[PDB]
Structure formats: structure tokens, C-alpha cells
């Protein structure tokens, strides 16, 4: 019931208590854990991934009701051996995602250090899944702007809570791409592209999202809802921003747009956005001098969007094209 190598990992069936020791995952291998239902998995060392040619995920854990106790240990992706400024768009192969977490349970207190590109992929789930007190430290990727597409958390799942986490990276802190009942609370995001829903692709539906209590600094965007211009049979519905404190934003404090991968222009109509609110505690956003405060670029948006608790200052005014939605309240124009 102690995993000391990639081959030990296949031998944990029957273990209600697994200890994950530190070791290196050699080139050409992956670490896959399928723990027993309700098992506790406790990390007792750091896991380092030698430079590899495999596609990600390099680490996959999949189980029901798992209790993962990280004890502040590290999954080290050796990302600087791969980073070339091009991420997953071109250039060197980047194993991605680094980690994949599937099923359900509670995952606490570990660090992902220097992922090659996207760090933690979440989903699908079979019950609630909570990630609590995880650090994605890709800060080294800022050097010479070589880290790219280093998303903290990519979520395509239902019934997820991500709380008390820290992300230092070069792309979305979180990107919520699909699923219902997703809560992102009391996290700290710096260096990247902010807190995102999307990009929303054809057939994907994000609903009942709560973005609460987070701090975002030194980022390209504060919060975004982005849908591919071309997406159809897609939607975002029921999003509440509450109590977020954001500053140091370079491009847009808020960008809600159906023109992706562009920020604005000829927005699509097949990924309707509805019921997007800034309520509860104040969401205060300070943007840089050349930044835009708030832009909404809808081809198809509906509802009474209560933005009473949003305050955005700095930079210049954006544009509001909200289609059928009525945006009330707040301070940003
Ligand atoms: C990738 O970069 C190479 C040059 O470094 C360029 O030839 C190629 O067209 C780029 N990839 C794509 C898909 O455009
Ligand atoms: C998981 O999500 C789906 C849709 O949100 C739902 O039917 C199921 O009730 C949720 N389960 C739990 C345990 O929250
Ligand atoms: O934030 C974004 O949407 C985009 O940022 C760009 O810098 C990146 O090259 C894209 O792949 C996408 O991640
Ligand atoms: Cl290899
Ligand atoms: Na995803």
C-alpha cells in the first residue's frame, strides 16, 4: 500500500490507506492511481517527472470519495525543459494536462511546480469534487516569457469546488469549459489571464457558477466569459461574481465576449449567455492605464444582469453590446 514507483501504482487495489512516496516518473511512463472507493491517499514525498515525449496527462487519479492528503508535497513537471514561448499553440511538444483528477472526493495541500503547459485538468466527476489549498507554481514561466498555456485549473465537470488555491502562471487561472455547479472561492491568481469561463465550444454548457472571494493581480484580464464565435448548441447560464478583488490588469477588467478567439468583433449567436451577476460582496477591479475597464460583446445574451456590486476603475471605457440582456447598476462606464 506504499507507492514507490510507477509500477507500484498498479498494485493498490484493496488499500484503504495508500502512501505515495517521492520518486521520479521516468521518461516514457505515466503515474496512474485508481484507489479503492473512499481511500485516503497521503503524499510522503515529491514526485518529479523526467523530461518525456508522452502526451499528458502524466499523472491521473480516478476514484470515488478519495481523500487526498498532500502534506505540502510537490508534483514537479520540469516545465522549463519544455517552455519555448509557444505553449500548446506551436513549438516544442508540451505534455498536457500535467495532472488529471477524475471522480470525486477532497484533494488538499499539494503543489504543482512548473507544469509543461496546462497544469490540472478536472473531470469528469461522479459526485462532489473539492480541490482545497493547492498551489500551481509556474512563476518560473514568466522568465523571458517562455511559459505559455500554463492554465491552473481546466474544468469540464459537474459539482466542483476549487478553494483556497494559489496560481502563479501565464494563462487562465481557471478555465471553466463545461459543467454545472462549479464554485471557485477564496483563491489567489497572479501573472496569468484571469478567471475564465470558456472558451465555450460547440455542444458545451456551463451553468450555476459562483466566483467568490478571489484575488487576482498582475494579469491580462480580470474576469472573462469567452465563447468561440463559431460555437453552436452551447451556453453559459447562471454566473455570480461575488467579493472578488482584482488589480494590475493589462487588457480588460471584464470581458464578456462571443467573438473568441478575438476579444471583440462580429460576435456569434450560438452560445447564449444568460443570468450573469456581480452581487454580494463588492467586486472591485483596478486596471492599468492602457487597459479597458469593461466590454460586453454579445451576439446572443439574455436576462436581467445585476451588476450592482461591480466597481471598475483605471484605464479607459469599453463598450457594451448586451443584445437582449439588460445590465443594471455598478460603476464602470
Ligand atoms: C509553427 O512554427 C513553424 C515555424 O517555427 C511554422 O513553420 C508553422 O507554420 C507553425 N505552425 C502552424 C500550425 O502554423
Ligand atoms: C452532480 O452534477 C449533476 C448535475 O449537476 C447532478 O445530477 C448530480 O446531482 C450532482 N451530484 C452531486 C453529488 O452533487
Ligand atoms: O487567454 C487566452 O484565451 C489565450 O491567451 C493567448 O495568449 C494564448 O496563446 C491562447 O492559446 C489562449 O490561451
Ligand atoms: Cl519519452
Ligand atoms: Na477542461
UniProtKB/TrEMBL annotation:
Keywords: Cell wall biogenesis/degradation, Disulfide bond, Glycosidase, Hydrolase, Repeat, Signal. GO terms for molecular function: polygalacturonase activity. It is an enzyme of class 3 (hydrolase). Beta-D-galacturonate binds at residues 89, 149, 171, 193, 224, 226, 260. It catalyses: (1,4-alpha-D-galacturonosyl)n+m + H2O = (1,4-alpha-D-galacturonosyl)n + (1,4-alpha-D-galacturonosyl)m. GO terms for cellular component: extracellular region. The active site is at residue 193. Its EC number is 3.2.1.15. Glycans are attached at residues 90, 159. Disulfide bonds join 1-15, 173-189, 298-301. Transmembrane segments: none annotated. GO terms for biological process: cell wall organization; pectin catabolic process. Belongs to the glycosyl hydrolase 28 family. This is endo-polygalacturonase. The gene is cppg1. The chain holds residues 27 to 359 of 403 of the full protein.
Amino acid at each position: 500500500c506504499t507507492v514507490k514507483s510507477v509500477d507500484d501504482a498498479k498494485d493498490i487495489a484493496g488499500c484503504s490507506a495508500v502512501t505515495l512516496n517521492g520518486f521520479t516518473v521516468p521518461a516514457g511512463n505515466t503515474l496512474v492511481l485508481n484507489p479503492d472507493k473512499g481511500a485516503t491517499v497521503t503524499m510522503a514525498g515529491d514526485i518529479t517527472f523526467a523530461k518525456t515525449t508522452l502526451d499528458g496527462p502524466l499523472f491521473t487519479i480516478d476514484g470515488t470519495g478519495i481523500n487526498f492528503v498532500g502534506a505540502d508535497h510537490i508534483f514537479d513537471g520540469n516545465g522549463a525543459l519544455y517552455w519555448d514561448g509557444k505553449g500548446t499553440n506551436n513549438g516544442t511538444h508540451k505534455p498536457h494536462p500535467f495532472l488529471k483528477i477524475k471522480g470525486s472526493g477532497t484533494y488538499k495541500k499539494f503543489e504543482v511546480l512548473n507544469s509543461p503547459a496546462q497544469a490540472i485538468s478536472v473531470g469528469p466527476t461522479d459526485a462532489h469534487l473539492t480541490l482545497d489549498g493547492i498551489t500551481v507554481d509556474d512563476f518560473a514561466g514568466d522568465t523571458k516569457n517562455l511559459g505559455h498555456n500554463t492554465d491552473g485549473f481546466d474544468v469540464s465537470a459537474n459539482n466542483v469546488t476549487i478553494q483556497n488555491c494559489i496560481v502563479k502562471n501565464q494563462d487562465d487561472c481557471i478555465a471553466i469549459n463545461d459543467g454545472n455547479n462549479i464554485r471557485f472561492e477564496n483563491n489567489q491568481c497572479s501573472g496569468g489571464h484571469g478567471i475564465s469561463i470558456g472558451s465555450i465550444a460547440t455542444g458545451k454548457h456551463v451553468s450555476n457558477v459562483v466566483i467568490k472571494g478571489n484575488t487576482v493581480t498582475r494579469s491580462m484580464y480580470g474576469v472573462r466569459i469567452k465563447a468561440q464565435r463559431t460555437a453552436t448548441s452551447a451556453s453559459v447560464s447562471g454566473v455570480t461574481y461575488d467579493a472578488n478583488t482584482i488589480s494590475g490588469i493589462a487588457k480588460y477588467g471584464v470581458l464578456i465576449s462571443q467573438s473568441y478567439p478575438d476579444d471583440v468583433g462580429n460576435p456569434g449567436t450560438g452560445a447564449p449567455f444568460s443570468d450573469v451577476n456581480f452581487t454580494g460582496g463588492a467586486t472591485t477591479i483596478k486596471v492599468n492605464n492602457a487597459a479597458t475597464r469593461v466590454t460586453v460583446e454579445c451576439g446572443n445574451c439574455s436576462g436581467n444582469w445585476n451588476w450592482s456590486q461591480l466597481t471598475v476603475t483605471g484605464g479607459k471605457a469599453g463598450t457594451i453590446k448586451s443584445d437582449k440582456a439588460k445590465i443594471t447598476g455598478g460603476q464602470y462606464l
